[PDB]
Amino acid sequence: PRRRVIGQRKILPDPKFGSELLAKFVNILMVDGKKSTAESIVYSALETLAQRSGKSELEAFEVALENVRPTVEVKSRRVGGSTYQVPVEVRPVRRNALAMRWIVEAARKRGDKSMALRLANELSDAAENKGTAVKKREDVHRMAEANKAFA
Amino acid sequence: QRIRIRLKAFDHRLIDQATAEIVETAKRTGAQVRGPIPLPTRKERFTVLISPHVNKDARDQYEIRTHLRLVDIVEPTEKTVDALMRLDLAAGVDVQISL
Amino acid sequence: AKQSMKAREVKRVALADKYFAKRAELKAIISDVNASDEDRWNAVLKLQTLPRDSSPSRQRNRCRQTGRPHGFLRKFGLSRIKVREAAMRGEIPGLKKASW
Amino acid sequence: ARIAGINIPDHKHAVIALTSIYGVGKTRSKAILAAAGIAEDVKISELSEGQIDTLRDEVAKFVVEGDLRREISMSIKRLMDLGCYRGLRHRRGLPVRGQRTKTNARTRKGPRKP
Amino acid sequence: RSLKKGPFIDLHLLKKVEKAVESGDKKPLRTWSRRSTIFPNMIGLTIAVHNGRQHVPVFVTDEMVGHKLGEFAPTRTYR
Amino acid sequence: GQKVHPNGIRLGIVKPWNSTWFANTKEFADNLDSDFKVRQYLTKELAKASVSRIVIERPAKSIRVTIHTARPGIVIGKKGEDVEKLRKVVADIAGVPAQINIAEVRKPELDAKLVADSITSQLERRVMFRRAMKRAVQNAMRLGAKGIKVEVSGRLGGAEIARTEWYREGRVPLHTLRADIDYNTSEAHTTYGVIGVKVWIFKGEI
Amino acid sequence: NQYYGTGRRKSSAARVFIKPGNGKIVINQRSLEQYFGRETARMVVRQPLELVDMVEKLDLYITVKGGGISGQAGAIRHGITRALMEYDESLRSELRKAGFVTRDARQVERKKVGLRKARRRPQFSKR
RNA sequence: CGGUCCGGCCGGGAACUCAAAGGAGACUGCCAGUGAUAAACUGGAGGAAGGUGGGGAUGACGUCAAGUCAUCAUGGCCCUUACGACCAGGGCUACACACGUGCUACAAUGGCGCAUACAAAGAGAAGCGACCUCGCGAGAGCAAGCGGACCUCAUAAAGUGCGUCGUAGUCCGGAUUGGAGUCUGCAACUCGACUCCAUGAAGUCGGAAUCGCUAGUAAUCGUGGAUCAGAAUGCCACGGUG
Ligand SMILES: [Mg+2]
Ligand SMILES: [Mg+2]
Ligand SMILES: [Mg+2]
Ligand SMILES: [Mg+2]
Ligand SMILES: [Mg+2]
Ligand SMILES: [Mg+2]
Ligand SMILES: [Mg+2]
Ligand SMILES: [Mg+2]
Ligand SMILES: [Mg+2]
């Protein structure tokens, strides 16, 4: 990425609802290149989440995603031997990509019976903004407002 | 009945040139000629260490391509059998006669 | 390898075709037949009295020019070093540097 | 529940509950339930005293628990008094079967000390 | 360890065990045969089994039957 | 760095094999040792006879050795006098009947093996290595070589610290597979060690 | 006469035959549902029959050899589109836009000497 | 298409898949923008492929008196009734420890049981060895085909369908050891692989620190090969999902 100015790979939409954002989400959860068992956990978690929150499977994801979605983050930069954290405004595409990544990582660190249950209860905690995933956006916020002078 | 000729050679531009001689000699002396049938090539691959001592990653990779050709002559005419028997073919080509 | 180490292999070949090819094979198949003689054979005992070097498993595959016991290939009968040397001179037929 | 060697099997499935005895693994537990005419996917609940004693009589055939522990220990001591290689290694607390001692042999040696 | 189709024993040592039974017990039987299986016709004899340098004399017992002669002659010195 | 054999890399492209015969896994090893043994005999016997290349082909159950030489008269002899004594023992070594063919090397100053063997035989006569290299280059360039390169390695002139010296005249594109590059080696067994000669001759493209 | 179109992706090779009438799918003398146990692999073969309309308009006799689940499924997708242009040729514009005409040249990269995989290099040690 | 033991299996058909020889094609060629009207870059059209399309082979003059006198060759030196040579047994496999590279794990994106869909690339006559039979099994006996797009190694596993376990040092994980065996080999004690029964360590995700990888890549899942009587978690190679 020094000289070469690359774009971004346009991935195929979701086989169920035709959402590109969900296709990003299944891939983030996906491990060992097992897409079949990956969408099986994402659909089972969406089926158990929308049922236990009042339908709208696309909108119930969006409510949980709006609370984890960050606005600003720090960028590590060494100027004069010292490492300064520069607060930078994140782009809309990476905004969702970080939001989805923290949802999967927080559900993985949970102690529930299954990943379909771990994900659904993490998406439920994020919809009401009271979990490990919303706290990762909170710690990223406290880091940005502190170094607000070096903007 | 039917005479089956199986050709083997490491060089390709030698096998189909010696095959063309067999096909032409048989179809000129009046015989029913099936083929030249190109059968799959057996690629015997070899990986040898290029350094006399140590240097595990440094290697030489070679192959021996064993090309196969099948020529089936239906009519065993005396004019065809004798024409094919007294044919000077390339010394680097193996001929397998199947009755 | 050494001249003595090369000579030791000539002895292991000459004794391999003398006994364990036409005589010891006959008493080994006999020491396997369940139908005939289950206790009084002596074939296992008379196999010992035969020279050790006569066994084919006791023979080591060595580079047919140098005598190298390591890096051997049965296709050429030479070690990886002398395989490369003859391969580059075109002395090995149909053999060339492959890429795929 | 209480079978052969004092032990009290839990209220789990029949095949896994029987592996609790020292001397009965996966194969012995499958063969014991096949000979006594009991299912493998059934719990200790519903299994009356009439079905317990028929399994106790079945398991009594092979050396289990304390009777097996002394038999294993006797064969270990036998090698030791004999003076063989196998016995000299049970006496030195090192791998008997032939495994390397230069490195990784921590199961028999125990945890390392500087 | 081996196929039940006959246990192994060296002919030169087997003939030495035979000569020791009829002529009566002598001094330690100097043998290099460590690969031979101990038979019941050995119990009571003193077989001097090699270790690589010296011949380790081992008094043959009934429990020693089935095992190899080289199990009772340590090959590596460790102190 | 380390370079790929110029003859080896061009095999199948613009350079032919020295062994054209075909065999299965069964007799491939037995034929290869027989090929070594026949070359060994002939190189030792026809050493002064200027042998450049040896081609072995096996028609059925026979051996057809094609000796490439700059001096065919000494190889053939007095009306086949020397060909008959060579073929008689080639048939003994190979087992199968022998047929020897003699190919004439017109301009030997354009043959890599003959140039290398000339430098090697010169170094053993106590000639100056620089003179031996310059003469090899000049002779090749005046006879039509598009380019030449001659390298001599180790204890040059009897020196204690070994050196690798080389002369080059013309075009020598070692990266073009299309290019006709004749490459060969030779070893000068001197009173003060082994001196390795490497010769590259560019003859033109295609 | 049958409308033909060859389709391939990875090591899979699929032959597609088009005949008008009904909405039948026969893959290697088996049903569409019987062969593929994944609905994602079922939807990719349905893809060419979206832009170009078909509910019960035309039948398809298909056979595929080599590769795997998505490999075979991807190959059939390319074949239907090639058999669709064989029938009209004015359908090229709609098929390009969706990217079904393009053969996916992505093959598995060879294992290289000195490397643990195609690109995976063994762990480096400084001291 | 004609005939059905519903098997391309047999007449046949040369359409197609494929096999392997020859040839076409992609060059910033076209269009537009940026740019000194240049080079070039960006985007688009057409196209199976677009800016060296993907991968490999190919490693300049030279650098480190870098590695190999144990592949071989070789100046010098040294032993030459011994530093040579033959043989048996042993050692290279030792074990207070330390470091490097790996495999397998710590589990429910998982373990187990049954049912089941889809590969690629290789090897083979002193060989690969089917089918049948015996043994829980490793195997064994009997014995076709095949020097091989025909026959054999060889059932691909991940995946999918159903059932079970339900966060437990566990139906996780397999070390270590006891008992009995199988095969190869003159011979498995030191020191082989594999099986059967029993045993069920550590480990519940790893400090300081550190490595690989930019796309059919990483990650994962099987398959084959060279060496090889026998002995792969190594190496070399192959595709599946991705
Ligand atoms: Mg020598
Ligand atoms: Mg061996
Ligand atoms: Mg137990
Ligand atoms: Mg082509
Ligand atoms: Mg280049
Ligand atoms: Mg040095
Ligand atoms: Mg050194
Ligand atoms: Mg287990
Ligand atoms: Mg890169």
Encode chain B in three state secondary structure. CCEEEEEEECCHHHHHHHHHHHHHHHHHCCCCEEEEEEEEEEEEEEEEECCCCCCCCCEEEEEEEEEEEEEEECCCCHHHHHHHHCCCCCCCCEEEEEC
Does residue B91 belong to the interface with chain C, where contact is any CB pair within 8 Å?
no
The tokens describing G24, both together, are 């039948």
- Residue B89, Ramachandran bin (φ over 0: left; ψ between -120 and 50: alpha; else beta): beta
Which of B68, B92, B81, B85 has its CA nearest to residue B7? B68
Q: Which nucleotide is nearest to F24 (CA to C1')?
A: H147
Chain H nucleotides covered by protein, CB below 7 Å: 15-22, 42-43, 46-49, 53-63, 65, 67-75, 84-102, 108-110, 117-126, 136, 140-141, 147-149, 156-161, 163-167, 170-171, 175-179, 181-193, 196-201, 210-221, 226-230, 235-242
Q: How many CA atoms lie within 13 A of E40 on its CB side?
A: 0
CB-CB under 8 Å, F22 with B8: yes
Q: Determine the residue of chain E that is closest to C33 in CA distance.
A: E5
CB-CB under 8 Å, B52 with C95: no
The DSSP-derived string for chain F is -PPPPHHHHTBTTTB--SB-----TTTHHHHHHHHHHHHHHHHHHTTTTTEEEEEEE--SS-EEEEEEES-HHHHH-SSSHHHHHHHHHHHHHHSS-EEEEEEE-S-GGG-HHHHHHHHHHHHTTT--HHHHHHHHHHHHHHTT-SEEEEEEESSGGG-SS--EEEEEEE---TT-TTS-EEEEEEEEEETTEEEEEEEEEE----
Distance CA G67, CA G9 (A): 9
D83 close to E72: Cβ distance less than 8 angstroms: yes
CA torsion sign, C34 to C39 to C42 to C48? positive
What is the maximal distance between C-alpha atoms in chain C?
61
All residues of chain D having their beta carbon less than 8 Å from the beta carbon of residue E34 are none
- CA separation, residue A9 to residues B86, C67, F84, G46, G101 (Å): 66, 57, 75, 24, 19
Given resolution (angstroms): 3.1
Identify the residue among B11, B13, B15 best suited for mutation to test binding to F, counting F beta carbons within 10 A and taking the highest. Answer: B11
Q: Which residues pair with B56 in a beta bridge?
A: none
Residues of chain F with CATH 3.30.300.20: 16-106
B36 close to B70: Cβ distance less than 8 angstroms: yes
- CA separation, residue F94 to residues C73, C74, D19, F61, G91 (Å): 22, 20, 71, 10, 69
Distance CA D8, CA C58 (A): 59
For domain F16-106, the question of CATH label 1.20.1050.10 is answered with no
Distance CA F64, CA B92 (A): 11
**Which class for F175: exposed (0-12), middle (13-18), buried (19 or more C-beta within 10 A)?**
exposed
Residues 12-51 of D with CB under 7 A from strand H: 12-13, 16, 19, 21-29, 41
Angle at A86 between CA A84 and CA A90, to 5 degrees: 150
F20 close to F57: Cβ distance less than 8 angstroms: yes
- Subunits next to F (3 or more Cβ pairs <8 Å) are B, C
Q: Determine the residue of chain E that is closest to D92 in CA distance.
A: E78
* Strand H atom within 7 Å of G91 CB: no
DSSP 3-state of A144? helix
Residue range(s) defining the domain that contains residue C62:
1-90
**Which class for C57: exposed (0-12), middle (13-18), buried (19 or more C-beta within 10 A)?**
exposed
Question: Regarding beta strands F63-69 and F164-170, do their DSSP bridges make them parallel or antiparallel, or are they unpaired?
Answer: unpaired
Indicate whether C76 belongs to any domain: yes
* Strand H atom within 7 Å of A90 CB: no
Distance CA E37, CA E8 (A): 6
Question: Whose structure tokens read 């020491």?
Answer: C31
Please tell me the number of the ligand nearest to residue F176's CA: 5
Residues 78-97 of D with CB under 7 A from strand H: 78-79, 85-86, 89-90, 92, 94-97
Which of D76, C80, E14, E16 has its CA nearest to residue B55? C80
Q: Determine the residue of chain C that is closest to E13 in CA distance.
A: C45
**Residue D32's CB: how many other CB atoms inside 10 A?**
22
Residues of chain F with CATH 3.30.1140.32: 107-206
DSSP 3-state of D49? helix
Distance CA G103, CA G84 (A): 15
Which of B71, B98, B12, B92 has its CA nearest to residue F60? B92
Which of C57, C76, C79 has its CA nearest to residue C12? C57
Residues 44-83 of B with CB under 7 A from strand H: 44-45, 47, 51-55, 57, 59, 61, 65, 67-68
Distance CA D84, CA E68 (A): 9
Indicate whether C100 belongs to any domain: no
- Residue F154, Ramachandran bin (φ over 0: left; ψ between -120 and 50: alpha; else beta): left
Q: Cis before residue D95, ω within 30 degrees of 0?
A: no
Q: Determine the residue of chain B that is closest to G114 in CA distance.
A: B57
**Count of structural domains, chain C:** 1
Distance CA G68, CA D12 (A): 41
F10 close to C89: Cβ distance less than 8 angstroms: no
The tokens describing A149, both together, are 């002078």
Sequence letter at residue D41: D
Residues with CB under 5 A from ligand 3 (ion): D 19
Identify the residue among C44, C49, C50, C52 best suited for mutation to test binding to E, counting E beta carbons within 10 A and taking the highest. Answer: C44
Which of G99, G80, G71 has its CA nearest to residue G17? G80
C73 close to C80: Cβ distance less than 8 angstroms: yes
Distance CA C83, CA G81 (A): 51
Q: Enumerate residues 6+ apart whose C-beta is below 8 A from D24.
A: D18, D32, D59, D62, D64
Indicate whether C42 belongs to any domain: yes
User: Which of the four CATH numbers 3.30.1140.32, 3.40.50.300, 3.30.1440.10, 1.10.10.10 does domain F107-206 have?
Assistant: 3.30.1140.32
The tokens describing F147, both together, are 């380019």
CB-CB under 8 Å, G40 with A39: yes
